[PDB]
């Protein structure tokens, strides 16, 4: 709520949310995407306004492997920076 | 108890007649294809259509009549003439026309002055102030004129209370309540108007960073309410006045007191707005 507005998620509900370069995302956003995937709703507690908006969006993502084209024989989760639990979603 | 009588207004009456005659008479330069007749009688008559209870007259026209000598009484001493310019104007309307709130807004001042150029000599005087708006606020009613009474208990006195305190009604009553007593607040008999505050800030192109530009309050009273927009430069009608306020511990002081304390600051007024700039 800025001097109310949804992120891409709320805005795109029922539609398709399109994100790229996860790796460059500040954690502050990362938690938001995680929550959205998890419960299919974004909750906002600030300032006085208190709700749960509903983003049902399909997330399509573009991610960039750590360093080179194929970083290692090592598994995908090892290949890229994004943690395994967010990836499991 | 008869009130004997009232005094004296002197020059105020001269300015009443001059301003009345001015708003009446041309006030016309152009000839042949005009821009002729009147324009101010035609202004009020055009105003009869929507009946929004405001008028627009140019200062440049007002300076032309006496060669600016008329505009001087209306310049530095201006706020002295606010009750006279209004009722006087009504004395015109009653003649030419058939629920009266009238907001007079002058415009087109010869020179625009910055907030930095604001002085304590400019008080009570029209000054055009240019700068960007910050922190607009929601419109709420002013008490304007009120009936607050009785006030012990049947009086029902409706008068004055125009100045901003708002305390108090019921003083020098009824005849005769002798309240004291309750104030007492009655909001159904009291006409309201406007208003929205905007905090005006100097434009960033003029200010020599390192600056830290100094904002100042301008409250919009009048039908020019809501005409202002955030992030944009606006020109206003001056009426600088002052408003009382609670300053931080070290001022450092100490301003005087009224004894049988007062703390004041510049709060600029605008009765007219434009998007120029």
């Amino acid at each position: 709520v800025r001097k109310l507005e949804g992120g891409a998620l709320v805005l795109a509900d029922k539609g398709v949310c399109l994100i790229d370069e996860f790796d460059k995302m500040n954690d502050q956003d990362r938690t938001s995407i995680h929550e959205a995937m998890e419960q299919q709703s974004i909750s906002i507690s600030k300032a006085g306004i208190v709700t749960t908006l509903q983003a049902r969006c399909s997330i399509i993502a573009a991610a960039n492997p750590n360093g080179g084209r194929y970083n290692s024989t090592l598994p995908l989760a090892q290949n890229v920076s994004l943690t395994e639990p967010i990836l499991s979603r | 108890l008869n009130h004997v009588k009232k005094v004296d207004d002197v020059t105020g009456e001269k300015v009443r007649e001059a301003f009345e005659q001015f708003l009446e008479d041309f006030s016309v330069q152009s000839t042949d294809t005009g821009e002729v007749e009147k324009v101010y009688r035609a202004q009020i008559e055009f105003m009869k259509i929507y009946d929004l209870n405001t008028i627009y007259i140019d200062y440049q026209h007002l300076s032309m009549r006496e060669n600016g000598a008329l505009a001087m009484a209306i310049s530095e001493q201006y706020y002295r003439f606010l009750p006279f310019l209004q009722k006087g104007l009504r004395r015109v309307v009653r003649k030419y026309a058939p629920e009266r709130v009238f907001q007079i807004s002058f415009f087109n001042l010869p020179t625009v002055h910055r907030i930095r150029d604001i002085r304590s000599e400019k008080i009570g005087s029209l000054l055009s102030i240019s700068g960007t708006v910050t922190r607009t606020s929601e419109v709420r009613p002013e008490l304007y004129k009120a009936s607050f009474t009785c006030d012990m208990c049947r009086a029902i006195v409706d008068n004055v209370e125009q100045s901003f305190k708002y305390t108090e009604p019921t003083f020098c009553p009824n005849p005769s309540c002798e309240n004291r007593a309750f104030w007492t607040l009655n909001v159904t008999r009291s006409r309201f108007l406007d208003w929205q505050k905007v905090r005006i800030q100097e434009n960033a192109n003029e200010i020599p960073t390192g600056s830290m530009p100094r904002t100042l309050d301008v409250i919009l009273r009048g039908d020019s309410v809501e005409r202002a927009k955030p992030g944009d430069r606006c020109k206003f009608t001056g009426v600088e006045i002052v408003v009382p306020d609670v300053t931080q511990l070290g001022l450092p002081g100490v301003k005087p007191s009224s004894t049988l304390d007062l703390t004041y600051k510049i709060s600029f007024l605008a009765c007219h707005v434009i998007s120029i700039g």
């Binding site: 109310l4 006085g48 306004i49 208190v50 709700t51 | 419109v139 009613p141 309750f182 159904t188 006409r191 309201f192 108007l193 406007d194 809501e226």
Partner: protein, 77 residues
């Protein structure tokens, strides 16, 4: 023992930001999003007691110028 009438659409249809003094005391339609609401706190409304002055209606909303025995409360929000 009281039914207050709901009175469906009444244009007007002033939105929010457009409002003036002219709207005082006069019913006006408004529209927009809700923001988080207070919990339900019973308001005083009617006053009654076994004696012991009589019933005093207060108010919307002043309350000037307390006993209670059986008072008819009505939820406020």
């Amino acid at each position: 023992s009281e039914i207050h009438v709901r009175i469906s659409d009444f244009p007007t249809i002033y939105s929010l930001r457009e409002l003036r003094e002219s709207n005082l005391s006069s019913l006006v339609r408004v529209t927009g999003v809700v923001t988080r609401r207070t919990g339900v706190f019973p308001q005083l409304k009617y006053v009654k007691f076994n004696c012991l002055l009589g019933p005093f209606f207060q108010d919307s909303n002043e309350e000037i110028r307390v006993n209670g025995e059986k008072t008819v409360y009505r939820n406020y929000q």
